Design a binder for this molecule. Structure first.
Ligand SMILES: COc1cc(O)c([C@@H](CC(=O)N2C[C@H](C)C[C@H](C)C2)c2ccc3c(c2)OCO3)c(OC)c1
Length: 228
């Protein structure tokens, strides 16, 4: 791949995420002053766990709805056998979602955008795992601190999916090629922006997995919804 092409490659990945941003960042920050009141909060605590995980998986699956449409318009993607085209899309998409929510994080008050307003980790007390909740908050913090940009998120998420180390792959020497040209397009654009400092500030390779993989286990008992 050449520079004029490595150019456009990066140029496209950022165009996708723009429309598939679920919520416009334009509106994400604008609604910062909209907060659930304590009754609205204690109201969200009244509910039984069964209700939340549904609401969760509802907006979640409605979100992953977008993610795929985003993930589809890439390059080299379609030209992968459907076995390997999916091993990724299945194992990858949650990790991607976890990332994509860092924008929803308002680090100024440690709150998150859930169905119309902003509220903290107490909005989800009823799920009985405050630790994992904060643990995710803590994760989203460590990116809100990196102050990820729209074009940064896109290019990093576009590398979460493309993992040729995911076992169960049969076009391995096909996947690798799409990884490299994405790894390269990533770094070589961080350089032209001089953001290379984050390449060590990046959340561990495995934390992103071991948090989403922990996100599904304590959901596997309540609902098993994997959208294709
Ligand atoms: C900050 O990281 C996350 C990760 C996520 O999975 C979610 C999920 C909800 C979820 O499963 N959780 C799991 C956790 C144990 C308790 C919390 C309710 C967040 C989500 C919700 C609404 C959405 C959405 C995505 O996209 C569109 O609207 C985040 O939203 C809060 C942030």
């Amino acid at each position: 791949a050449s520079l004029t092409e490595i150019e456009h490659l990066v140029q496209s990945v950022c165009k996708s995420y723009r429309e598939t941003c679920q919520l416009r960042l334009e509106d994400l920050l604008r609604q910062r002053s909209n907060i659930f009141s304590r009754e609205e909060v204690t109201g969200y605590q009244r509910k039984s766990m069964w209700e939340m995980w549904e609401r969760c998986a509802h907006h979640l699956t409605e979100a992953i709805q977008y993610v795929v449409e985003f993930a589809k318009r890439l390059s080299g993607f379609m030209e992968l056998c459907q076995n390997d085209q999916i091993v990724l899309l299945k194992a990858g998409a949650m990790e991607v979602v976890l990332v994509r929510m860092c924008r929803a994080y308002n680090a100024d008050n440690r709150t998150v955008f859930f169905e119309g307003k902003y509220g903290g980790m107490e909005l989800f007390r009823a799920l009985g795992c405050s630790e994992l909740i904060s643990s995710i908050f803590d994760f989203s913090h460590s990116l809100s601190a990196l102050h990820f940009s729209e074009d940064e998120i896109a290019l990093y998420t576009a590398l979460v999916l493309i993992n040729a180390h995911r076992p169960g792959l049969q076009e391995k020497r096909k996947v690798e090629q799409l990884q490299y040209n994405l790894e390269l397009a990533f770094h070589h654009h961080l350089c032209k922006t001089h953001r290379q400092s984050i390449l060590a500030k990046l959340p561990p390779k495995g934390k992103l997995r071991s948090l989403c993989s922990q996100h599904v286990e304590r959901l596997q008992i309540f609902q098993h919804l994997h959208p294709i």
